Amino acid sequence: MDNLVLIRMKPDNGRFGFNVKGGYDQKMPVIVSRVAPGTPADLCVPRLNEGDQVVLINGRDIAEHTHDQVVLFIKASELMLLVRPNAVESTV
Amino acid sequence: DNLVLIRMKPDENGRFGFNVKGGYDQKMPVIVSRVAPGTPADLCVPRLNEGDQVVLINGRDIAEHTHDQVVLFIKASCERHSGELMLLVRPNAVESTV
Numbered sequence: 001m002d003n004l005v006l007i008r009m010k011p012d013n014g015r016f017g018f019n020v021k022g023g024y025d026q027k028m029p030v031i032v033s034r035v036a037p038g039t040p041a042d043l044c045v046p047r048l049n050e051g052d053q054v055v056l057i058n059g060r061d062i063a064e065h066t067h068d069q070v071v072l073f074i075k076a077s078e079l080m081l082l083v084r085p086n087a088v089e090s091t092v
Numbered sequence: 093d094n095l096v097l098i099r100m101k102p103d104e105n106g107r108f109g110f111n112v113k114g115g116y117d118q119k120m121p122v123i124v125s126r127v128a129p130g131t132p133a134d135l136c137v138p139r140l141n142e143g144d145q146v147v148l149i150n151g152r153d154i155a156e157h158t159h160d161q162v163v164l165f166i167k168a169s170c171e172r173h174s175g176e177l178m179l180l181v182r183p184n185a186v187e188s189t190v
Binding site for chain 2: 013015016018019020021026033034036037067068071074075
């Protein structure tokens with residue numbers, strides 16, 4: 001789509017501080033389900049927000065990758081995520 | 093197997109900030125049904141996630157323990173090593189932490 005947002009993020013343990021649900025095997029988009037306070041995903045600009053939909057992981061189109069394959073791409077990471085922002089909460 | 097080991101210190105009121113359902117008497121696995129924002133369960137690393145199934149509590153296998161026994165095990169401060177609750181959980185397959 002248009003108005004995608006590029007989020008950049010450095011790990012803490014190798015951790016970013018966010019949860020994801022979804023994936024091709026779940027027939028659901030990959031959605032950020034929790035961003036924990038004080039973590040890289042919480043403190044980065046632009047912020048990673050819950051309800052944001054992950055579109056690219058380090059340039060890779062993940063639309064047809066499974067939940068567990070998505071998780072492995074993230075941990076195999078800066079982390080570059082291209083997200084479709086949730087409609088309810090916006091960063092400025 | 094794909095288990096996750098979690099350790100968690102209680103808040104100032106001795107609470108951890110999650111709900112459990114299930115147990116031997118319910119013929120249902122012990123599952124985390126809610127994890128409240130900003131509670132120890134939400135903020136621990138690895139995080140405790142909703143839908144995670146509890147396998148061990150402070151080293152104890154809870155497979156044949158009742159719901160009320162399981163709750164008692166979580167609340168028992170004298171079974172905690174270094175003031176921490178230990179849980180070994182099977183992560184829910186839908187939500188993952190990174």
